[PDB]
Amino acid sequence: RVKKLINSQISLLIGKGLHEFDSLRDPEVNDFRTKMRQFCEEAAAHRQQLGWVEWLQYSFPLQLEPSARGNRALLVNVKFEGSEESFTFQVSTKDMPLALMACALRKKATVFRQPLVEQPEEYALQVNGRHEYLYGNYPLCHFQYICSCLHSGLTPHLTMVHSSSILAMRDEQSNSLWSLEQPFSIELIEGRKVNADERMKLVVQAGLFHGNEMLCKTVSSSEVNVCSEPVWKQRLEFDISVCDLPRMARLCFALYAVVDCPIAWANLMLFDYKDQLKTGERCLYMWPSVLLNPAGTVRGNPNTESAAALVIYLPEVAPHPVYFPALEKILELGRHGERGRITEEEQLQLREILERELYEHEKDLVWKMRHEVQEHFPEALARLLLVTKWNKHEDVAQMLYLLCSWPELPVLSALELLDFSFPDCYVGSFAIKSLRKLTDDELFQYLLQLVQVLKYESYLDCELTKFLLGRALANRKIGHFLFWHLRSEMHVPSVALRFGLIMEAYCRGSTHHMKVLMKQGEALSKLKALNDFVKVSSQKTTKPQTKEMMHMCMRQETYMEALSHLQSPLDPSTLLEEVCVEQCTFMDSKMKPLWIMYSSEEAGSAGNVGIIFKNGDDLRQDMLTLQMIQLMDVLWKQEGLDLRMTPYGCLPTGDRTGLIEVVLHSDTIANIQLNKSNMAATAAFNKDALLNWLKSKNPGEALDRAIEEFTLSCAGYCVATYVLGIGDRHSDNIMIRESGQLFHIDFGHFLGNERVPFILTYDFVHVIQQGKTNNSEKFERFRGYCERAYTILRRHGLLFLHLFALMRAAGLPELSCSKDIQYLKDSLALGKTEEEALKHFRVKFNEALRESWKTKVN
Numbered sequence: 001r002v003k004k005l006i007n008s009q010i011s012l013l014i015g016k017g018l019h020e021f022d023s024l025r026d027p028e029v030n031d032f033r034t035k036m037r038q039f040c041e042e043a044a045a046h047r048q049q050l051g052w053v054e055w056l057q058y059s060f061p062l063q064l065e066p067s068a069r070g071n072r073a074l075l076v077n078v079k080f081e082g083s084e085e086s087f088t089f090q091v092s093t094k095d096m097p098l099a100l101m102a103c104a105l106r107k108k109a110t111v112f113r114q115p116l117v118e119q120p121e122e123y124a125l126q127v128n129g130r131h132e133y134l135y136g137n138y139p140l141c142h143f144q145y146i147c148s149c150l151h152s153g154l155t156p157h158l159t160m161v162h163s164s165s166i167l168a169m170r171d172e173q174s175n176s177l178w179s180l181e182q183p184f185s186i187e188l189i190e191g192r193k194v195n196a197d198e199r200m201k202l203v204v205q206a207g208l209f210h211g212n213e214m215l216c217k218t219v220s221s222s223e224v225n226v227c228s229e230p231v232w233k234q235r236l237e238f239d240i241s242v243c244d245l246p247r248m249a250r251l252c253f254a255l256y257a258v259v260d261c262p263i264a265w266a267n268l269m270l271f272d273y274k275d276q277l278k279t280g281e282r283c284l285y286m287w288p289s290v291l292l293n294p295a296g297t298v299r300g301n302p303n304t305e306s307a308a309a310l311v312i313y314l315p316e317v318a319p320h321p322v323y324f325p326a327l328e329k330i331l332e333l334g335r336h337g338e339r340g341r342i343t344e345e346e347q348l349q350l351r352e353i354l355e356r357e358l359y360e361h362e363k364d365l366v367w368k369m370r371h372e373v374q375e376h377f378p379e380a381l382a383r384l385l386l387v388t389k390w391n392k393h394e395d396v397a398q399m400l401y402l403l404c405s406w407p408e409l410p411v412l413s414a415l416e417l418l419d420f421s422f423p424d425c426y427v428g429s430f431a432i433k434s435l436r437k438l439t440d441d442e443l444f445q446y447l448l449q450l451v452q453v454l455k456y457e458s459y460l461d462c463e464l465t466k467f468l469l470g471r472a473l474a475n476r477k478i479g480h481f482l483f484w485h486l487r488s489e490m491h492v493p494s495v496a497l498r499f500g501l502i503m504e505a506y507c508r509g510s511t512h513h514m515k516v517l518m519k520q521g522e523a524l525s526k527l528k529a530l531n532d533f534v535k536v537s538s539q540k541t542t543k544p545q546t547k548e549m550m551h552m553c554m555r556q557e558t559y560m561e562a563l564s565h566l567q568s569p570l571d572p573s574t575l576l577e578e579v580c581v582e583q584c585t586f587m588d589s590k591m592k593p594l595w596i597m598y599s600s601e602e603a604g605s606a607g608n609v610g611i612i613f614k615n616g617d618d619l620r621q622d623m624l625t626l627q628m629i630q631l632m633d634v635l636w637k638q639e640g641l642d643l644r645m646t647p648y649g650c651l652p653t654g655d656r657t658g659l660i661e662v663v664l665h666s667d668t669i670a671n672i673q674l675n676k677s678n679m680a681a682t683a684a685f686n687k688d689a690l691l692n693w694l695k696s697k698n699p700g701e702a703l704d705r706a707i708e709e710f711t712l713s714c715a716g717y718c719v720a721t722y723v724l725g726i727g728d729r730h731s732d733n734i735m736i737r738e739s740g741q742l743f744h745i746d747f748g749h750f751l752g753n754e755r756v757p758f759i760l761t762y763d764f765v766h767v768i769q770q771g772k773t774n775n776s777e778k779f780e781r782f783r784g785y786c787e788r789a790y791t792i793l794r795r796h797g798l799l800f801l802h803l804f805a806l807m808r809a810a811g812l813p814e815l816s817c818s819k820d821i822q823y824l825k826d827s828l829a830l831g832k833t834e835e836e837a838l839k840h841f842r843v844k845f846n847e848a849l850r851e852s853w854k855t856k857v858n
């Protein structure tokens with residue numbers, strides 16, 4: 001009776017009725033659902049018997065300063081849970097939270113006149129009106145909240161939570177092949193539901209691929225006239241023996257009418273998930289094209305009513321079922337071989353090509369010397385896997401014998417092995433095995449990417465699915481973001497199945513979070529409906545009248561209930577409590593996004609947050625551009641360079657639907673540039689507007705930090721926008737914070753999509769120099785910041801180049817081919833030495849400085 005209640009709720013949350021999974025009557029889906037439910041059930045169980053501190057590490061994972069993960073006078077306002085009274089203590093930034101708790105329980109004792117039994121080990125420090133906690137043995141300054149407070153000059157507000165209270169929340173949440181030498185062949189029987197120009201003839205181009213690389217030369221079909229139902233019944237004979245086919249082998253098809261014009265495409269794995277070599281008739285429900293597309297999904301098109309079907313016949317090779325040899329048989333064959341016996345002369349050449357694409361003889365050198373490659377250069381695994389001939393059974397057995405006994409690579413090297421260039425499942429398992437060491441902070445930084453690698457998966461049940469699920473159930477934030485990255489792509493038919501199953505499994509592992517995300521979903525349902533009125537009304541009537549019948553609408557009992565008392569999809573630590581209906585408006589852009597305001601009694605001024613709801617644009621590129629800027633900011637802070645960046649939240653939630661974080665107390669450059677009369681910023685020259693503006697937002701001595709806050713953020717934004725190749729930078733998409741902090745918004749076109757140069761703007765160069773015309777001292781400190789930020793970004797170029805490589809799986813039209821990844825392999829300048837790249841960056845900056853001189857002349 002509780003089950004059907006849970007199952008109706010899962011289906012509603014994922015926006016796909018679980019009956020549809022059963023309807024397919026697919027044994028691969030039916031096994032994932034049983035196998036993965038069990039895993040998640042085991043997880044939930046282990047989680048319900050966690051310690052009170054351990055539970056904190058789940059529900060509220062520590063938010064630490066990049067500098068700290070891996071002295072100064074500070075006033076702090078601590079209170080106790082069931083209390084109205086509070087205390088202000090003058091702690092230090094070097095103090096552990098415990099000394100504060102010890103301080104708080106001493107003050108409580110004296111006030112309440114009682115010799116207190118309580119110890120500070122029994123307590124935790126909640127951030128007031130937040131799902132943020134201050135625990136462990138880390139100085140206060142190490143905590144992101146405490147640190148933000150010092151910069152903003154604000155007083156940290158903490159509530160003392162007893163172990164009993166945490167436990168009370170913990171509780172309230174309890175739920176043989178190698179013999180077959182014949183050349184692999186197929187029968188292209190017929191086609192169905194095809195549409196093409198009568199004047200042409202149809203062709204089927206089939207090819208055998210292992211990731212991207214061809215396993216052999218592709219074979220085309222006979223030219224058969226344009227018919228909705230064309231018939232071939234021909235034998236497509238491929239130049240590859242049945243034994244030689246690898247385990248992760250995929251057969252790709254291309255249907256195209258020629259006089260070139262592609263109709264559709266469809267791929268499939270020759271081996272089933274249970275390692276059986278597929279035999280019988282197969283009807284490939286193709287996907288529309290825009291000649292082979294390996295990377296494309298191996299499971300058929302769901303809408304079978306429009307889709308052009310291709311019926312093929314996998315012939316019976318042996319008299320009984322053939323299963324891919326087990327590792328036992330694989331390691332036996334690859335054990336024996338001739339070891340790499342070569343001259344120190346050719347060993348020198350080997351170190352060169354490994355430390356440094358490569359020539360044919362060079363590959364042969366990497367393959368003959370594979371044992372040395374494992375012994376003295378293990379990080380060079382990927383390059384060795386690329387010299388391997390996956391179209392010969394014995395070379396693969398040789399490779400997998402070296403991998404099985406290969407040392408665990410670092411996290412940076414394991415990210416390369418997730419890419420489609422390495423489709424071997426034992427290589428991927430090893431990749432995840434080398435990735436397991438990932439810190440929960442690190443994992444979260446690369447989760448967007450590892451979730452995109454799920455689209456490169458051949459089979460439903462895989463290491464990556466199990467690893468992400470197990471990690472998501474071990475950290476409520478990872479679980480929050482995992483769900484939303486999955487949920488947002490349910491409209492896409494090529495993933496709706498996989499994703500739905502992943503999310504259904506997750507729900508079995510966290511019944512309570514399933515209720516929390518359903519609460520969030522129900523709010524976004526109302527916002528989609530509200531935005532629809534706004535889109536319509538903004539056309540007919542004026543903004544004051546739309547802004548009013550939108551409030552009236554939000555005032556309704558359904559709206560008031562759904563839009564209030566929830567966690568933010570933008571950050572689950574953020575508790576969007578009571579909605580400020582009067583403070584709610586909508587931007588005047590094409591889509592008419594919504595500005596939703598929130599406020600809290602508990603959180604206080606730190607609880608007055610805002611969100612932006614947008615329906616109409618694809619939000620996946622901005623999300624990527626902002627994760628990159630945030631990573632840039634993490635990589636800089638790690639080297640002690642804090643360029644005071646603002647990577648505000650962005651999160652796609654559904655079909656062309658998402659949320660953007662309101663950065664309160666910020667305004668677009670342009671708005672200030674308007675130089676309106678009767679204001680506190682009204683200038684005699686347009687050059688002054690920003691400076692005069694900062695003056696008013698930063699009186700007296702406060703101006704000097706604001707200018708410096710401006711300089712750093714500007715250094716970082718120039719450097720963030722150069723590397724990423726962010727174009728279309730007008731006055732609108734640049735915003736300034738009252739603190740002086742500068743930031744960018746609306747990331748329409750990155751990776752030069754032609755070739756975006758270094759950008760410098762005299763209106764900000766006038767602010768940097770503190771109003772002065774010639775101020776080489778202050779300006780050249782800004783040039784120094786740019787150089788520092790640029791060189792730190794280059795030293796992590798393989799990290800950006802690996803996260804952009806994997807991100808190709810999303811299908812962002814400004815990130816799909818080789819040239820897009822060349823952009824970073826040109827901006828981060830990884831061919832040139834640090835000195836040769838620094839030479840070229842200064843030459844790029846000076847050119848921008850000269851370009852900025854178009855205004856200094858006028």
Ligand SMILES: COc1ncc(-c2cc(NC(=O)CN3CCOCC3)c3cocc3c2)cc1NS(C)(=O)=O
Pocket residue numbers: 587588589590591593612614622648660661662663664666667668671735745746747
């Ligand atoms: C991806 O699109 C966007 N990317 C970013 C933002 C965005 C916008 C902000 N603020 C405003 O637009 C304030 N306005 C209100 C109306 O008068 C002018 C000033 C933000 C402040 O903190 C983070 C912000 C992020 C918006 C869009 N969508 S749009 C450009 O079509 O409205």
